[PDB]
Design a protein around this nucleic acid. Structure first.
Ligand SMILES: [Mg+2]
Ligand SMILES: [Mg+2]
Ligand SMILES: [Mg+2]
Ligand SMILES: [Mg+2]
Ligand SMILES: [Mg+2]
Ligand SMILES: [Mg+2]
Ligand SMILES: [Mg+2]
Ligand SMILES: [Mg+2]
Ligand SMILES: [Mg+2]
Ligand SMILES: [Mg+2]
Ligand SMILES: [Mg+2]
Ligand SMILES: [Mg+2]
Ligand SMILES: [Mg+2]
Ligand SMILES: [Mg+2]
Ligand SMILES: [Mg+2]
Ligand SMILES: [Mg+2]
Ligand SMILES: [Mg+2]
Ligand SMILES: [Mg+2]
Ligand SMILES: [Mg+2]
Ligand SMILES: [Mg+2]
Ligand SMILES: [Mg+2]
Ligand SMILES: [Mg+2]
Ligand SMILES: [Mg+2]
Ligand SMILES: [Mg+2]
Ligand SMILES: [Mg+2]
Ligand SMILES: [Mg+2]
Ligand SMILES: [Mg+2]
Ligand SMILES: [Mg+2]
Ligand SMILES: [Mg+2]
Length: 62
RNA sequence: AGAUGGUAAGGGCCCACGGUGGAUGCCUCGGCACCCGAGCCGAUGAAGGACGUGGCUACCUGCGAUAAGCCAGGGGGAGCCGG
Protein backbone atom coordinates (compact mmCIF):
# COMPACT_ATOMS: atom_id res chain seq x y z
CA UNK A 1 0.00 0.00 0.00
CA UNK A 2 3.08 2.23 0.36
CA UNK A 3 2.63 3.06 -3.34
CA UNK A 4 -0.68 4.95 -3.33
CA UNK A 5 0.51 7.13 -0.48
CA UNK A 6 3.69 8.53 -2.01
CA UNK A 7 2.60 8.49 -5.66
CA UNK A 8 -0.45 10.63 -4.83
CA UNK A 9 1.84 13.02 -2.97
CA UNK A 10 4.13 13.03 -5.99
CA UNK A 11 1.84 14.96 -8.30
CA UNK A 12 0.95 16.71 -5.06
CA UNK A 13 4.64 17.59 -5.32
CA UNK A 14 3.50 20.05 -7.99
CA UNK A 15 4.20 23.31 -6.17
CA UNK A 16 7.29 23.62 -8.37
CA UNK A 17 6.99 19.93 -9.16
CA UNK A 18 9.60 19.06 -11.75
CA UNK A 19 12.15 21.14 -9.88
CA UNK A 20 10.98 19.99 -6.46
CA UNK A 21 10.95 16.44 -7.82
CA UNK A 22 14.59 16.63 -8.79
CA UNK A 23 15.52 18.03 -5.39
CA UNK A 24 13.59 15.12 -3.94
CA UNK A 25 15.11 12.35 -6.05
CA UNK A 26 18.49 13.92 -5.41
CA UNK A 27 17.86 13.73 -1.66
CA UNK A 28 16.58 10.17 -1.89
CA UNK A 29 19.66 8.99 -3.77
CA UNK A 30 21.92 10.41 -1.07
CA UNK A 31 19.95 8.52 1.56
CA UNK A 32 20.37 5.40 -0.53
CA UNK A 33 24.11 5.96 -0.83
CA UNK A 34 24.38 6.34 2.92
CA UNK A 35 22.39 3.11 3.02
CA UNK A 36 24.81 1.32 0.68
CA UNK A 37 27.59 2.39 3.04
CA UNK A 38 25.43 1.26 5.94
CA UNK A 39 25.02 -2.25 4.58
CA UNK A 40 28.58 -2.08 3.29
CA UNK A 41 30.24 -1.71 6.70
CA UNK A 42 28.28 -4.80 7.68
CA UNK A 43 26.53 -4.62 11.04
CA UNK A 44 23.84 -2.18 9.91
CA UNK A 45 20.57 -1.78 7.96
CA UNK A 46 18.01 -4.50 7.24
CA UNK A 47 17.49 -4.94 3.51
CA UNK A 48 14.15 -3.65 2.27
CA UNK A 49 15.04 -0.08 3.22
CA UNK A 50 17.20 -0.18 0.07
CA UNK A 51 14.79 -2.16 -2.11
CA UNK A 52 11.91 0.16 -1.18
CA UNK A 53 14.09 3.21 -1.57
CA UNK A 54 15.13 2.18 -5.08
CA UNK A 55 11.52 1.72 -6.16
CA UNK A 56 10.44 4.95 -4.49
CA UNK A 57 13.01 6.73 -6.64
CA UNK A 58 11.76 4.93 -9.77
CA UNK A 59 8.29 6.25 -9.01
CA UNK A 60 9.74 9.61 -8.08
CA UNK A 61 11.67 9.46 -11.34
CA UNK A 62 8.44 10.18 -13.21
C1' A B 1 62.01 -110.32 -0.07
C1' G B 2 57.28 -110.07 -4.02
C1' A B 3 52.99 -107.42 -5.09
C1' U B 4 49.18 -102.93 -4.21
C1' G B 5 47.87 -96.73 -1.70
C1' G B 6 47.55 -91.16 -0.39
C1' U B 7 48.69 -85.25 -1.18
C1' A B 8 46.95 -79.34 -4.51
C1' A B 9 51.69 -74.95 -5.37
C1' G B 10 47.99 -73.95 -8.83
C1' G B 11 44.26 -75.25 -12.42
C1' G B 12 39.37 -77.03 -14.47
C1' C B 13 33.69 -77.87 -14.38
C1' C B 14 29.42 -76.94 -11.15
C1' C B 15 26.58 -74.44 -6.98
C1' A B 16 25.65 -70.15 -3.62
C1' C B 17 26.54 -64.91 -2.56
C1' G B 18 28.71 -60.72 -4.16
C1' G B 19 31.59 -56.65 -6.91
C1' U B 20 31.86 -54.11 -11.64
C1' G B 21 28.70 -52.81 -15.51
C1' G B 22 24.07 -50.42 -17.29
C1' A B 23 21.30 -54.10 -21.24
C1' U B 24 15.78 -55.12 -20.39
C1' G B 25 10.76 -53.42 -18.67
C1' C B 26 8.19 -49.55 -17.29
C1' C B 27 8.32 -44.07 -17.30
C1' U B 28 8.62 -38.88 -19.95
C1' C B 29 9.88 -31.74 -19.33
C1' G B 30 11.26 -33.73 -25.19
C1' G B 31 11.25 -34.84 -30.21
C1' C B 32 8.87 -36.15 -35.44
C1' A B 33 4.76 -35.90 -38.95
C1' C B 34 0.35 -34.15 -40.89
C1' C B 35 -3.72 -30.58 -40.41
C1' C B 36 -5.69 -25.85 -38.82
C1' G B 37 -4.53 -21.18 -37.36
C1' A B 38 -1.32 -17.11 -38.02
C1' G B 39 2.60 -14.22 -40.89
C1' C B 40 6.78 -9.43 -41.33
C1' C B 41 10.40 -6.65 -37.78
C1' G B 42 13.67 -2.17 -38.32
C1' A B 43 16.55 5.44 -38.01
C1' U B 44 10.34 6.08 -32.77
C1' G B 45 17.42 2.26 -33.84
C1' A B 46 15.47 -4.19 -35.63
C1' A B 47 17.76 -9.14 -35.55
C1' G B 48 21.52 -10.52 -32.47
C1' G B 49 24.70 -9.11 -28.65
C1' A B 50 28.51 -6.85 -24.68
C1' C B 51 28.62 -5.08 -19.68
C1' G B 52 26.07 -4.31 -15.91
C1' U B 53 21.30 -5.29 -12.21
C1' G B 54 19.54 -8.88 -6.06
C1' G B 55 21.05 -6.96 1.48
C1' C B 56 24.44 -11.72 0.99
C1' U B 57 24.49 -14.12 -5.90
C1' A B 58 28.34 -19.02 -9.16
C1' C B 59 25.11 -19.94 -13.11
C1' C B 60 20.24 -19.73 -15.33
C1' U B 61 16.23 -16.51 -15.68
C1' G B 62 14.09 -11.36 -15.81
C1' C B 63 15.43 -6.43 -16.26
C1' G B 64 18.28 -2.12 -17.82
C1' A B 65 21.73 3.09 -14.13
C1' U B 66 14.06 4.16 -12.60
C1' A B 67 18.00 -2.27 -13.88
C1' A B 68 14.24 -10.09 -10.73
C1' G B 69 11.95 -3.75 -11.74
C1' C B 70 8.27 2.04 -12.68
C1' C B 71 3.10 3.85 -13.95
C1' A B 72 -2.24 3.20 -15.61
C1' G B 73 -6.67 0.13 -17.21
C1' G B 74 -8.76 -4.93 -17.16
C1' G B 75 -8.60 -9.79 -15.04
C1' G B 76 -8.38 -12.44 -10.50
C1' G B 77 -9.40 -13.23 -4.72
C1' A B 78 -5.12 -15.42 -0.78
C1' G B 79 -1.20 -15.41 -0.79
C1' C B 80 3.84 -13.01 -2.12
C1' C B 81 9.52 -11.13 -2.51
C1' G B 82 12.11 -16.17 -9.98
C1' G B 83 14.65 -21.30 -10.38
MG1 LIG C 1 42.44 -77.55 -5.94
MG1 LIG D 1 24.10 -73.75 -1.95
MG1 LIG E 1 26.60 -61.51 -10.17
MG1 LIG F 1 27.05 -48.97 -10.62
MG1 LIG G 1 20.74 -45.98 -13.41
MG1 LIG H 1 7.84 -47.23 -12.84
MG1 LIG I 1 4.62 -51.16 -23.73
MG1 LIG J 1 4.45 -35.13 -27.02
MG1 LIG K 1 9.48 -28.47 -30.60
MG1 LIG L 1 9.61 -39.50 -35.64
MG1 LIG M 1 -2.71 -28.00 -47.35
MG1 LIG N 1 -7.50 -17.68 -43.15
MG1 LIG O 1 -2.69 -15.73 -44.31
MG1 LIG P 1 -3.12 -9.69 -42.05
MG1 LIG Q 1 11.09 2.18 -41.98
MG1 LIG R 1 9.76 -2.01 -44.13
MG1 LIG S 1 16.12 9.82 -43.01
MG1 LIG T 1 19.88 -10.37 -28.49
MG1 LIG U 1 18.99 -15.47 -28.14
MG1 LIG V 1 20.13 -8.86 -22.58
MG1 LIG W 1 26.04 -7.89 -7.27
MG1 LIG X 1 19.69 -13.89 -20.61
MG1 LIG Y 1 21.98 -11.68 -16.74
MG1 LIG Z 1 14.51 -12.26 -22.30
MG1 LIG a 1 8.11 5.50 -13.69
MG1 LIG b 1 2.88 -17.41 3.97
MG1 LIG c 1 12.46 -11.02 -6.31
MG1 LIG d 1 14.08 -15.07 -0.96
MG1 LIG e 1 10.79 -24.40 -9.99
Amino acid sequence: MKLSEVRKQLEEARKLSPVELEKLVREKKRELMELRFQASIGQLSQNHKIRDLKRQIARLLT
